Design a protein around this ligand. Structure first.
Ligand code: PLP
Ligand code: PLP
Lengths: 334, 338
């Protein structure tokens, strides 16, 4: 028997109130492996259920809403951030609701898709020199702040603890949804707001929970390697964010870009869940935990930051995989 | 005011299909700020893009496949087929993936390449038909395939399948529960008509006096008895009256111009921060038109929002950049006289 969702029994005052309370869903297709025991539970928390389909919805909202409550953002000021991704979308959504102008700086070469999304929300785009990358976008933001003191609130996603703090809700949802049974949480790391915010709130609930960060093998900076070229969009920032707190992270798992994409392909094919690239990374790390003998019967929760639809212009679904399901899962796990 | 985000669901879903439905009902504020709309009337949008694949059709793909499995119309060995280049294709692929059935989707080779990619990701077999022939070419090929392979295929038949309409009794129950029975008017832009009919069937059981409004393109006003015509409101205006349409359940039909549907959608995202799709712009505009009627003062108006704007980035939806303040834009959208 299969029951769909019941009424929410709420009228939301605006779209920001629909942020969070994201669903926790059992994996079955990709967990069908002789070495993963029946009792081991592998669950994915689908952050693309947020109104703009990513985990960053929580971040854009909390950063802006807190700044407004704080007086760090007040009438006549504008929001600014250098970002070409989900954070920019999330800031645009918050700014639209609150009635604050949003300025997003990114290299002109970037996501013309996400550019259009940001413009649709009424953002002013600051398109910087393509060859200078994100450093060039940050550079222009700093120049604008210098020339206009008092005008701008900078979101500062990698240094702002309102990022981290938003994920106390993420943690509370994992705790409640699992009835306190969660044993391990796996999170692919971009800003690190999720892994740290979740870790600190869950540790408050149960010290024994294992917290696993995931990063690209090609840019394993949390593990002390250097910034390198990789293809896992949304993670591998190439530095350790100021909001990172190593004390709260129990293990770091490196995942190859190609394996993350291949995992994401298997998850949509065998579970009907259209996860993004970083989710492929997290889920593979989670499956690797799930086959460990010391983890038999444990409840493993894996954060899924975004949906595959935001990746159609990428190479994510371009490579075809050879073999049967078990062949594909063996190739990922070996 | 205090802004509070959503509480935990307090559920572990056995699979992705269990996350379908129970979509949020959200107040509009920004686009309702016009002198002709009274403070007391409540204008709400039901955001069907909260479904796992971001459209109302998740309910339809699911219920069509599930009810067919339960009935025995779909059984092991058979494959699912449908000619569709829209959201129904995606919803069938999602259902097929979870239930473990092959899904065959037919569409013109030139139509929605992005959602072609989405469907293939889900493991669907794409039947790409001659571009110039359009959807009739796709329907023709599905017809050929089922004729040659009797018993092999289960046809979803979205425009004639009572399981489409039936799925919307849940949509109706959600509207009913979320409004504490206060809902007065439901506005739905019509594609298959599953939503407007299924909602009407169930709500008309709850209380007398709930006004059911269908919305269609001004250019293809076939429900109002006008002739089929070219229009740009993706997801609606099929050009015919679907077999599941029941005119007795519909109180009024509102035609909306393509250009106005787009402009409304642009306004909703900019002033309410809600990224609704094209057909949503049509439904919302119709809803605001209801909200300005004096007989509707203080009523609760519920507008179906079938899809999100991100599915429209390759269209002209956001290419036109409206000049003018919020009040000029809203005033220009409501200014038609009748
Ligand atoms: C932000 C993001 C992440 C990482 O989440 P953090 O909380 O920033 O570490 C992973 N994937 C995608 C697609 C993201 O946008
Ligand atoms: C299906 C659909 C509609 C219309 O809903 P019906 O229940 O088929 O009438 C409107 N917009 C979009 C984008 C759709 O996919």
């Amino acid at each position: 028997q299969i029951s769909i969702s019941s009424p929410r029994k709420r009228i939301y005052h605006n779209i920001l109130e629909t942020i969070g309370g994201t669903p926790l869903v059992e994996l079955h297709g990709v967990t069908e492996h002789p070495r993963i025991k029946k009792g081991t539970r592998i669950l994915v928390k689908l952050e693309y259920f947020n109104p703009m389909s990513s985990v960053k919805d929580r971040v854009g909202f909390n950063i802006v809403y807190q700044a407004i409550k704080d007086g760090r953002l007040k009438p006549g000021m504008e929001i600014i951030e250098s970002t070409s991704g989900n954070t920019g979308i999330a800031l645009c959504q918050a700014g639209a609701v609150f009635g604050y102008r949003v300025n997003i700086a990114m290299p002109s070469t970037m996501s013309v898709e996400r550019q259009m999304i940001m413009k649709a929300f009424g953002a002013e785009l600051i398109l910087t020199e393509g060859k200078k990358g994100m450093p060039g976008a940050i550079e222009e933001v700093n120049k604008m702040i210098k020339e206009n003191p008092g005008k701008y609130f900078v979101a500062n996603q990698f240094g702002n603890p309102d990022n981290t703090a938003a994920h106390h809700y993420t943690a509370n949802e994992i705790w409640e949804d699992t009835d306190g049974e969660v044993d391990i949480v796996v999170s692919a790391v971009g800003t690190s707001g999720t892994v740290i915010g979740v870790a600190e709130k869950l540790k408050e609930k149960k010290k024994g929970i294992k917290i696993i960060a995931v990063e690209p093998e090609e840019s394993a900076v949390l593990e002390g390697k250097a910034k390198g070229p990789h293809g896992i969009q949304g993670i591998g920032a190439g530095f350790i964010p100021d909001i990172y707190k190593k004390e709260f992270v129990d293990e770091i798992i490196p995942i190859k870009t190609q394996d993350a994409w291949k995992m994401a392909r298997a998850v949509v094919k065998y579970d009907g869940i259209m996860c993004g690239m970083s989710s492929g990374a997290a889920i593979l790390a989670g499956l690797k935990e799930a086959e460990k003998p010391e983890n038999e019967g444990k409840t493993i929760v894996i954060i899924v930051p975004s949906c595959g639809e935001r990746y159609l212009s990428t190479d994510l679904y371009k490579i075809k995989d050879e073999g049967t399901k078990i062949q594909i899962l063996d190739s990922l796990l070996n």
